[PDB]
Design a protein around this ligand. Structure first.
Ligand SMILES: Nc1ncnc2c1ncn2[C@@H]1O[C@H](COP(=O)(O)OP(=O)(O)OP(=O)(O)OP(=O)(O)OC[C@H]2O[C@@H](n3cnc4c(N)ncnc43)[C@H](O)[C@@H]2O)[C@@H](O)[C@H]1O
Ligand SMILES: Nc1ncnc2c1ncn2[C@@H]1O[C@H](COP(=O)(O)OP(=O)(O)OP(=O)(O)OP(=O)(O)OC[C@H]2O[C@@H](n3cnc4c(N)ncnc43)[C@H](O)[C@@H]2O)[C@@H](O)[C@H]1O
Ligand SMILES: NC(=O)[C@@H](N)CCCC[NH3+]
Ligand SMILES: NC(=O)[C@@H](N)CCCC[NH3+]
Ligand SMILES: [Mg+2]
Ligand SMILES: [Mg+2]
Ligand SMILES: [Mg+2]
Ligand SMILES: [Mg+2]
Ligand SMILES: [Mg+2]
Ligand SMILES: [Mg+2]
Lengths: 484, 484
């Protein structure tokens, strides 16, 4: 097992050093990637290749190897795929051949040679120069799901498919910045360490600054500092960055994740709905070529315009209870009991409406849907709806049964905002340890005047999951948080 | 007094509501920015303007106001600048004119009207519709440095040159990603919360995950996880993200900053030198239009190729001391005493060489200089130079007397690497509380084989300071860390 093959690999390490070669290599110049070779010469016949003597230089990890006396084959793998190499002793010389023979699966090498096809028609490289680049002290794993996440590098090597999800992830984010940049939004960087962790309902990670002897909280949202920039007059700003929440992991939750937050002065949540469907459609179109995608067993149509549905109307359609009716908190609690909806001590009418939605409705929303009108009690930073103040002009985007975005007509009334924070502090006294805390610096900012604004927050990891048909967030994160 | 002004603004808020207006506004559609207006017709005589009746719609903060009677003026400011508005009671009507009259400096408004020039020919908007958008409860500052950092929004409103710095910052980062993307590097996101804080010599911020009951350290570098991706076979990766160091602030230090870390398989530190100068020169050319820049009292030429200077040769040129000669630790300590170079208990020849450089040489490196050959003792993750192993194939980029980048031919030998960490542990016991920790997970990764690689780390904030002629990092960070 270990120390077994391990001792052998250490032994070969010394043998290589004794042959006057650096077992960990120097720089190496390549001319092609494996895939490029196939694209360019894959359809040429054995004869055509012999007549063109195309010389190339490539490098990669040895994945397979078969020795045959004075000559041998091996498949080396680079970031684009595998290419077979053929090494003959009489061609590369005794010294280089000795290096080929001592080479192990896992070792990394560089080669120069001419393109040719074997009798089975496999495009290969007839090696003229064999360069040893790096000795692998451990063998490639036996070719479990957890190892893929615990040791991502092994996943990337053994499951060539896996890298594609991450390449696509980069294209998704680049497409996102392209759209926002071209539409006038300024990409900014605001603090990730806050005096007060606000902007969302979540438990924060607490830390300490030694030199300044100060308690800091990793940000649970980007909202409050971006709003300060709107007060500052920047008008259109966005930030795609890490957010941290001290909470358990799930197929859709990781303690550190990437969120897009953006704010636009002079817009309201209806404008943000349009921006959201356009942005996501733009991304899907550029990256996948279409807005009609497959996710799990669902055919999801991301083609704008998406469905708009008030949360109360959603509960009426999917459950049957009509919360448009003015009722007491006690009446709402009774309904919750009758319909199997779990509620907490601090909850009143608004919280209960939301619980009805989350527990009995949201998982049925497969096609992109803008659920709007969130009760005021759970929307401390959103402006109340003018017609019915029990609700706010806020919406959440639901796709394949989960929330992908959250946005609102931002609350810019400082007096109302202070009141919302006071109500949140009261909720905390009643058991809601996720309630928003007071932020006087933020209220001060609002007092200098924040224009009417439309704000948006998108879970980038979740969007990447949707567009790559990944069932878990652990599949779109290179190094997801692992349990002890 | 200020207290008096607050009461007044508080009462005006009530009078506006009494006028049936939402004092915090609704969405407002605009057609132009203040600067666009001047660009499109800042020279068009009042005649043509009067004939064309060019209707426009803008919005912004009232910075100045003047006039009495049934006609008045005001200068509103948007993200691009200021534009004078002319409001006449006989045009907008009684109710709207009353709103104009009650409007305070600081309040935000939207207007629709036609372009025109006053007697003095000042481009202005002849208002046809006056929309009150937001009441400022606090007065704008009457037209302190640290105060501008504490309330960045006030700075952005009162000082237009500051906002430009941040717009330029975004352009610099955009230009950086374009270059890297176009040169084949894959943009990735790796963990910011680590089991073991490694990749640099620095004190970490410590935190705790409750549900997992796990101690986590905010990353002090991005290196170790990116190296895992190189083992993973990704070949070219980069990440521009936040890094956290539990240390005091300075003219070029903030507890959380942005760093670019990049790794390229099959390249060495010389290749990285070229990449670094080409990248920075590219960004300068794109953003400033030239590689000739000004920083403080210095004229800095960023045109490649930059000077390459070995640390030992730099000390010889500036201090008159030669460290190429083989010498004992005591001989080095003797030289340190003679030249007034402070040293710590855990220091030997290698550390002392670096102390000579940092204490007597670095501040004089104004023009871009690649200082290379750092002693192995202070380079635990860099490969030793083949000809003189007392030094490593590492370089730091110095410009205007400070370090902007750190890079090396990566140490891919797992056996050597473990030994480097062991020597680091020894130093920690000798008083070096910034010594690197023993990362078994990282060592395991190298044991599967990491190809020869060239790595780079650039302080983005410092690069932004350089290209925006900002004397402090506090000038290029929207919200720099404030003291208590
Ligand atoms: N820790 C947990 N473990 C298991 N189940 C849990 C759970 N927390 C909640 N659930 C369950 O998931 C369902 C919905 O819960 P909700 O609490 O209503 O929604 P959420 O998934 O927690 O996102 P959040 O409400 O915080 O979004 P936010 O606007 O702040 O932020 C904006 C966007 O950021 C993204 N986002 C938020 N948190 C994220 C995370 N930790 N990881 C990745 N993305 C995240 C999302 O796209 C979100 O729309 C319910 O069944 C609930 O019980
Ligand atoms: N906190 C402090 N306050 C006052 N004086 C101090 C100080 N720390 C050091 N000094 C003094 O500055 C001079 C040089 O000290 P050094 O310790 O050699 O320089 P450094 O600025 O600390 O860069 P470092 O070595 O940590 O960067 P790294 O490659 O790891 O990482 C790669 C790149 O990241 C950037 N970077 C590193 N730390 C940063 C930070 N905290 N903020 C912004 N950028 C940073 C840089 O561009 C660096 O090249 C000496 O006089 C020293 O005493
Ligand atoms: N929940 C959150 O993280 C919010 N800060 C996302 C943005 C909502 C609209 N302002
Ligand atoms: N000291 C640091 O932060 C290094 N991780 C910067 C990169 C050096 C080259 N690998
Ligand atoms: Mg949550
Ligand atoms: Mg939610
Ligand atoms: Mg949400
Ligand atoms: Mg430092
Ligand atoms: Mg240094
Ligand atoms: Mg440095």
């Amino acid at each position: 097992e270990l120390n077994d093959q391990l001792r052998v690999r250490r032994e070969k390490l010394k043998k290589i050093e004794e042959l006057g070669v650096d077992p960990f290599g120097k720089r190496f110049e390549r001319t092609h990637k494996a895939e490029e070779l196939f694209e360019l010469y894959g359809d040429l016949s054995k004869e055509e290749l012999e007549e063109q003597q195309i010389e190339v230089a490539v490098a990669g990890r040895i994945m397979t190897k078969r020795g045959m006396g004075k000559a041998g084959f091996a498949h080396i793998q680079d970031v684009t795929g595998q290419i077979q190499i053929y090494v003959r002793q009489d061609d590369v010389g005794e010294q280089q051949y000795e290096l080929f023979k001592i080479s192990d699966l896992g070792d990394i090498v560089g080669v120069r040679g001419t393109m040719f096809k074997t009798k089975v028609g496999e495009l290969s490289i007839k090696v003229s120069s064999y360069e040893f680049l790096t000795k692998a002290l451990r063998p490639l794993p036996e070719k479990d799901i957890e190892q893929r996440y615990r040791q991502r590098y092994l996943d990337l090597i053994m499951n060539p498919e896996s890298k594609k999800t991450f390449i696509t992830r980069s294209l998704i984010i680049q497409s996102m910045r392209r759209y926002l940049d071209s539409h006038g939004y300024l990409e900014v960087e605001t603090p990730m360490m806050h005096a007060v962790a606000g902007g969302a309902a979540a438990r924060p990670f607490i830390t300490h600054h030694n030199a300044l002897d100060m308690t800091l909280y990793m940000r649970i949202a980007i909202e409050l500092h971006l709003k300060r920039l709107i007060v500052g007059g920047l008008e259109k700003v966005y930030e795609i960055g890490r957010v941290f929440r001290n909470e358990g992991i799930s197929t859709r939750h990781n303690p550190e994740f990437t969120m897009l937050e953006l704010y636009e002065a002079y817009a309201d949540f209806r404008d943000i709905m349009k921006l959201t469907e356009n942005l996501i459609a733009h991304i899907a179109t550029e990256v996948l070529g279409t807005t009609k995608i497959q996710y799990g067993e669902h055919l999801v149509d991301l083609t704008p315009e998406w469905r708009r549905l008030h949360m109360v109307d959603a509960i009426k359609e999917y459950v049957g209870v009509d919360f448009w009716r003015q009722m007491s908190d006690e009446e709402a609690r009774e309904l919750a009991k009758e319909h199997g909806v779990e509620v907490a001590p601090h909850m009143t009418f608004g919280h209960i409406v939301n619980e009805f939605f989350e527990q009995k409705v949201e998982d049925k929303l497969i096609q992109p849907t803008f659920i709007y009108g969130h009760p005021v009690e759970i929307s401390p930073l959103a402006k109340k709806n003018p017609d019915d103040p029990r609700f706010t002009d806020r919406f959440e985007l639901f796709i394949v049964g989960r929330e992908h975005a959250n946005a609102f007509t931002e609350l810019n009334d400082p007096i109302d905002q202070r009141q919302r924070f006071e109500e949140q502090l009261k909720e905390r006294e009643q058991g809601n340890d996720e309630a928003h805390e007071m932020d006087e610096d933020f209220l001060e900012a609002l007092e200098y005047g924040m224009p009417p604004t439309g704000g948006l927050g998108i879970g980038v990891d979740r969007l990447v999951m949707l567009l790559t048909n990944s069932p878990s967030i652990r599949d779109v994160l290179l190094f997801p948080q692992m349990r002890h």
